[PDB]
Design a protein around this ligand. Structure first.
Ligand code: GUA
Ligand code: GUA
Lengths: 311, 311
């Protein structure tokens, strides 16, 4: 009887969003602009298709699900993607544009994007927007530093890993969806609903990323992600010691297959997949208060799509 | 007859400002804080005496010259110094905390300070403050990129050099003094007066810095500053070619004394000193509309002090 039993697939999501996404991409091009040639060249290299990405998609779908009557979500989407791009540039120094243009330029163009995003925020003329994004971006910075601290630390806890995911990835998604609610003057209940959707969706996406690494860039650098940690926690004495050493010394690739084996035997990747599935469902469940629309259906489909590669 | 004929000296300026400056330094300590250990350690290393510096001094003197009735200038001073410190950290990558803690951490803690400064701005509850500082910080980023472009470029013009000084140094001073006017709800005329004071003061300070380099860190890196450029422009054919090559190749120290000689013969350092003197006087002249007070006298003394080492 239910003709719309299937969740919305990616092609339909992307077709639905396309007019908004192309408008975001155009705004990003016009906003990347400065008189300074190097900014324009590095900018082109890193953000020429910036409006055609996941965080802008989320943002425009959220705003349309909330019946936005302006084009302020195009500005918001560009802000969010500039924050993401600035973060990426800076993270690749501390670990690409920095390989191509140097650490220095990548840092400074990161700052150019970052500061420009705040200038765009000011055009929205909302102190609440500034509060939300200044809080979010400070959290991101803290999360990136916490991540850098955890590197080579085999005593990293599950809670600390999850705090890194939350701060460095999920918080920006959470802000984007909350801000769609702010711009459209929604109730506290609806704002909370959208905030939770973003937070959990972003969590799902990062968990899946960490799974797909092993399904070993992280291994190489001594990065303690959940699959590697969980394998260490549940492995036999020799397995645990191999992984501890890999984390401390970065020599994991010399024991690549034994480590991958430990992950299989302990169900470490499975456990991480379970956490991703949970986040995805929590995101979907958060949208209960939201009015039905094709944009709501797209947000639900995105949550399904986030964990598709993992089932 | 005039018992106060002498401009206020540095000891009197610093004594007058000390209660405010110690309050700024305390706020900076409390605001540097996070749960993340590395932020607290790098933070301590770079900003533990941040409230005892030139930009906070300027800011608190400006606000008191405008009869501020709150302590919002302590927040402003901390914001300005966080912006400066974040910039410095980032600039030292692209060229110290990065030598000590690594490029990566220095970049990210820079971002922590930067984003925290915006969170502090939000506490001032003024959209105009956010507009001014988002504009200023984007200008700084652009200026830092323009500087990086000019490096090793012997065709850099005087106008381009001055644009770098204006964007990378003077604009932040200009914002600080303008913002003292914004916080104390001054007229447009008084705001303009304070803005100009900061702009010209910051210009003076940077010119003096560039003079004092030669009075050869810049030489080493192919940096085209006014003294080196002017020497090239006015030197004989052999002198000009030596300096052109030094800029392009960074081999200037192999011709250290001939270059220094060219600067002497051409009056290149003198010409730059003349520009610094001019900026200093323009700053003093901008304060004409400001009500008399000991804080006004301190601002005037600071402008004199800026160029003292050069006369
Ligand atoms: O509701 C707020 O104003 C706080 C925003 C923090 C966030 O959830 O992203
Ligand atoms: O007056 C304004 O609102 C613009 C501030 C730019 C500046 O002079 O620093």
């Amino acid at each position: 009887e239910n003709l719309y039993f299937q969740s919305m697939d990616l092609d339909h999501i992307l077709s639905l969003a396309e007019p908004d996404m192309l408008a975001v991409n155009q705004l990003i091009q016009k906003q990347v602009n400065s008189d300074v040639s190097l900014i324009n060249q590095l900018g082109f290299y890193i953000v020429n298709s910036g409006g055609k990405r996941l965080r802008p998609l989320l943002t425009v779908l959220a705003a349309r699900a909330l019946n936005i009557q302006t084009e302020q979500h195009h500005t918001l989407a560009a802000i969010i993607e500039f924050i993401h791009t600035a973060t990426l540039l800076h993270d690749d120094v501390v670990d690409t544009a920095n390989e191509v243009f140097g650490n220095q330029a990548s840092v400074l163009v990161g700052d150019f994007l970052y500061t420009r995003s705040f200038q765009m925020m000011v055009t929205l003329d909302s102190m609440r927007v500034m509060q939300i994004l200044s809080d979010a971006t400070n959290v991101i910075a803290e999360g990136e530093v916490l991540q850098l601290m955890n590197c080579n630390d085999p005593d990293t806890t599950e809670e600390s890993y999850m705090e890194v995911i939350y701060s460095k990835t999920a918080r920006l998604f959470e802000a984007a969806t909350l801000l769609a609610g702010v711009l459209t003057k929604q109730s506290e209940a609806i704002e909370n609903a959208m905030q939770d959707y973003g937070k959990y969706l972003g969590t799902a996406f990062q968990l899946v990323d960490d799974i797909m690494d092993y399904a070993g860039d992280d291994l190489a650098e001594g990065k303690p992600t959940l699959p590697l940690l969980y394998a260490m926690w549940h492995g036999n004495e020799q397995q645990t010691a191999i992984i501890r050493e890999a984390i401390e010394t970065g020599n994991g690739m010399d024991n690549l297959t034994p480590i991958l084996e430990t992950m299989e035997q302990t169900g470490a990747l499975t456990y991480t997949k379970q956490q991703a599935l949970k986040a995805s469902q929590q995101a979907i469940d958060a949208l209960s208060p939201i009015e039905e629309s094709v944009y709501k259906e797209a947000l639900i489909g995105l949550a399904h799509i986030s964990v598709e590669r993992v089932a």
